[PDB]
Structure 1
Amino acid sequence: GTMYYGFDIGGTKIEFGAFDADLVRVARERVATPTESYAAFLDAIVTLVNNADAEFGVKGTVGIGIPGIADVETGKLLTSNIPAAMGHTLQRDLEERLQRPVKIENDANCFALSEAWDEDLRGEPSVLGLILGTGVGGGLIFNGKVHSGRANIAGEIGHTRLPYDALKLLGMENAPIFPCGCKNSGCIDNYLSGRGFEQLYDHYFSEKLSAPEIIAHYEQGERRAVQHVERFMELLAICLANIFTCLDPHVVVLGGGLSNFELIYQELPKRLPAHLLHVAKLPKIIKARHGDAGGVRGAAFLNL
């Protein structure tokens, strides 16, 4: 008999949801992520909670999915695509402002948790939730339970470096080596995300187009976009084949902005086998069943 709030915080947008005691979604809000000012970042979150509390006449529970890691010892955030939040004790800061406990979990973990709880995936021995947004994130579920890892880093596939076969595709010593918000270089976060898709286009063609614009040019059969999409589909297959040789997930669920690129679901099953072991069988690869809400739902229900 509560109200449960969830936040799904990404590099560019914050999604907010409120769910009643029967878990029905009764609020839905979206705001831009403040990426520069930490004060503005906190304000955005606090406003949404306060507004919802005023609307429903309650003090809602607060679960937040963050695009990054709260240090397991200090609580300070590493959010590679949110400069504003870097180094701050988000949980503590919010508990102060909102005068109640706050649970923080990684965004991809929340997404994976929600998607794995779907009746269709109940009973699957493993599920990998993959977010391809401003960054690349993974949530690892084994027998229905999240593996969050020794230091809340499990599933941080975005901060693994391009594998040799991917570098080969991109031209080896001539490959674009993109800087990462984690301060490393060549992290796949900057290649397979919708942002990375854009950066790869710009690197090869010297024009700053959005992912939806490139995809639209692709749909028209425009030469540069067709070349870009071929390169990207192969890069995606190579990188995910490496990850699947380590993790071998039963089901892979894709979320984030770039998960709306329908071609991915056609091309991945065709391109993965060449890069997997000979006896590998493909995982079930599906688009998010909860649309754009799995992160919010996962976050909200941390307080269940």
Structure 2
Amino acid sequence: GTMYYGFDIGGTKIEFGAFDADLVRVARERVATPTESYAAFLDAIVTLVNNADAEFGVKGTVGIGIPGIADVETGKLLTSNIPAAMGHTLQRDLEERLQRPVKIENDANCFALSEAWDEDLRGEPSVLGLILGTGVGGGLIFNGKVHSGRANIAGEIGHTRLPYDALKLLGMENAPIFPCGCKNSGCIDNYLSGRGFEQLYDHYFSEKLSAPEIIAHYEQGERRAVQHVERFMELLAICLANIFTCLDPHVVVLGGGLSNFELIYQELPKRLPAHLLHVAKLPKIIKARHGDAGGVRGAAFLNL
């Protein structure tokens, strides 16, 4: 039988998953992300493939989802989330030290592919998978196929700069201009992420709270948190309206930590129309149907 393996490699932990011909998840393991050695990164992955090869008596197709980009020419990763990985040719290493073809894909692309494979979305002309978590990431699907881009950068909406209307909301020349991991400044990755949410609160209120704690205070109706959340929802709507005016997606699926903030699903539909073109219609906006598993599933499904 056909087995499909998937890996979701994150900053803090690696997640492994195995799916059978019916796509039933028959294995799930989480090891910590080995950092400060790349010998140790590599090992963790080939470890899990091997264990699983034995345990099911086969060697199945392999897919990897990682944050950042495999250079379309050299094969080397830009991934400032994973110190241990950066600069290496991850694909090639695994491809021989495993005796079979390895597919590699950006994490947001895996997420979008996982969500779009749902029966409900499979025939939509376009799907945008948006991760609002550690960073801001996008996966573009057109007629069921990932658009990965000339250099594997398609959907890197997190490294676009705040638009004018967002800057105006945040005070124009007084707006906080956050530095970015890509080395540019004012990229939305640092505003609409969970970390961006926290940095914004701290900028206006001079207190170093976590997103969950701000949100808890919001649910208690506390004044600063209510003001922060109003500002954040308007900022989110402005930024997304700019993106939707370019992409006009049929369905937008949200993932990552902030996708669990339920107010988003109420506030986005109310706030987007003001920033969209007058003749625009709202996309269908939905919370991820597979929770946190999109990375693993999409990585495995690269070899469907």
Fold conserved between structures, TM > 0.5: yes
**CA distance 1:186–1:100, shift in 2 (3 Å):** same
Q: CA deviation at 1:120?
A: 1.0
Cα-Cα RMSD: 1.7
**CA distance 1:84–1:198, shift in 2 (3 Å):** farther
Q: CA deviation at 1:290?
A: 1.5
**CA distance 1:224–1:45, shift in 2 (3 Å):** farther
**CA distance 1:132–1:44, shift in 2 (3 Å):** farther
1:228-282 deviation line (CA, Å, top 9, x unaligned)? 2111111110100000000000000001111111111011001101111111110
Q: CA deviation at 1:40?
A: 3.7
Q: CA deviation at 1:20?
A: 1.6
**CA distance 1:162–1:302, shift in 2 (3 Å):** same
Q: CA deviation at 1:121?
A: 1.2
| Stretch deviating more after TM superposition (183-192 or 7-16) | 7-16
**CA distance 1:34–1:160, shift in 2 (3 Å):** farther
Task: Provide the rounded CA distance (Å) in 1 between the counterparts of 2:26 and 2:246.
Answer: 40
Q: CA deviation at 1:147?
A: 0.9
Q: CA deviation at 1:8?
A: 1.9
TM-score w.r.t. the length of structure 2 is 0.94
**CA distance 1:206–1:97, shift in 2 (3 Å):** farther
**CA distance 1:28–1:98, shift in 2 (3 Å):** same
Q: CA deviation at 1:226?
A: 1.5
Preserved CA contact (<8 Å) 1:129 1:254? yes
Work out the percentage of aligned pairs sharing the same amino acid: 100
Preserved CA contact (<8 Å) 1:18 1:27? yes
Q: CA deviation at 1:214?
A: 1.7
**CA distance 1:34–1:231, shift in 2 (3 Å):** farther
| Stretch deviating more after TM superposition (189-198 or 34-43) | 34-43
Task: For residue 114 of structure 2, give the secondary structure of its aligned residue in structure 1.
Answer: helix
| Stretch deviating more after TM superposition (51-60 or 168-177) | 51-60
Task: For residue 35 of structure 1, give the secondary structure of its aligned residue in structure 2.
Answer: coil
Q: CA deviation at 1:79?
A: 1.6
Q: CA deviation at 1:96?
A: 4.2
**CA distance 1:177–1:224, shift in 2 (3 Å):** same
| Stretch deviating more after TM superposition (41-50 or 72-81) | 41-50
Q: Paired residue for 1:263? A: 263
Q: How many residues align?
A: 304
Task: Provide the rounded CA distance (Å) in 2 between the counterparts of 1:55 and 1:261.
Answer: 39
Task: For residue 47 of structure 1, give the secondary structure of its aligned residue in structure 2.
Answer: helix
1:105-154 deviation line (CA, Å, top 9, x unaligned)? 11111111121121111221110000111111111111111111111111
Q: CA deviation at 1:157?
A: 0.5
**CA distance 1:247–1:179, shift in 2 (3 Å):** same
**CA distance 1:37–1:213, shift in 2 (3 Å):** farther
Q: CA deviation at 1:39?
A: 3.5
Preserved CA contact (<8 Å) 1:9 1:15? yes
**CA distance 1:149–1:96, shift in 2 (3 Å):** same
Preserved CA contact (<8 Å) 1:163 1:239? yes
Task: Provide the rounded CA distance (Å) in 1 between the counterparts of 2:234 and 2:102.
Answer: 41
**CA distance 1:58–1:142, shift in 2 (3 Å):** same
Q: Paired residue for 2:156? A: 156
Task: Provide the rounded CA distance (Å) in 2 between the counterparts of 1:35 and 1:216.
Answer: 33
Task: Provide the rounded CA distance (Å) in 2 between the counterparts of 1:42 and 1:224.
Answer: 45
**CA distance 1:202–1:259, shift in 2 (3 Å):** same
5+ residue gaps in structure 1?
Answer: none
**CA distance 1:46–1:236, shift in 2 (3 Å):** same
TM-score w.r.t. the length of structure 1 is 0.94
Preserved CA contact (<8 Å) 1:7 1:17? yes
Preserved CA contact (<8 Å) 1:12 1:134? no
Preserved CA contact (<8 Å) 1:11 1:134? no
Task: For residue 98 of structure 1, give the secondary structure of its aligned residue in structure 2.
Answer: coil
Q: CA deviation at 1:75?
A: 0.7
Task: For residue 272 of structure 1, give the secondary structure of its aligned residue in structure 2.
Answer: helix
